[PDB]
Amino acid sequence: LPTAQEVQGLMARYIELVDVGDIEAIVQMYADDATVEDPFGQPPIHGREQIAAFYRQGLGGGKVRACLTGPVRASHNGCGAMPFRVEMVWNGQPCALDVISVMRFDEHGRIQTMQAYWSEVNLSV
Incomplete structure (x- = not known):
């Protein structure tokens, strides 16, 4: 079970992997x-x-x-939360989405649950 500092490391790591598009x-x-x-x-995916x-659908x-x-x-x-x-x-049009993600990590340092908060109010062009 990650410490608060390890949670900060894992969640910043998540963002990095998303940014470089490494699905695997x-x-x-x-x-x-x-x-x-x-x-x-x-509904949650499992x-x-x-x-x-x-x-893949989102980053492919x-x-x-x-x-x-x-x-x-x-x-x-x-657990942790990050903006x-x-x-x-x-369509070629750049857009941005503001998100807050909440994660719970398990006893092995792996993500057990992720919840991503956003809607159309958080989208801009």
């Missing part, structure tokens, strides 16, 4: 029975293949970017 590396941060709610409110499929095009927009806030029970911005490209 991201999927491996997840526990075998992880769940992903993205956007939070939608299992490594479905999570893999999710990240290659041009997607991401960076932290403030520090990671970490707990002493293996970030995702730059992506629907």
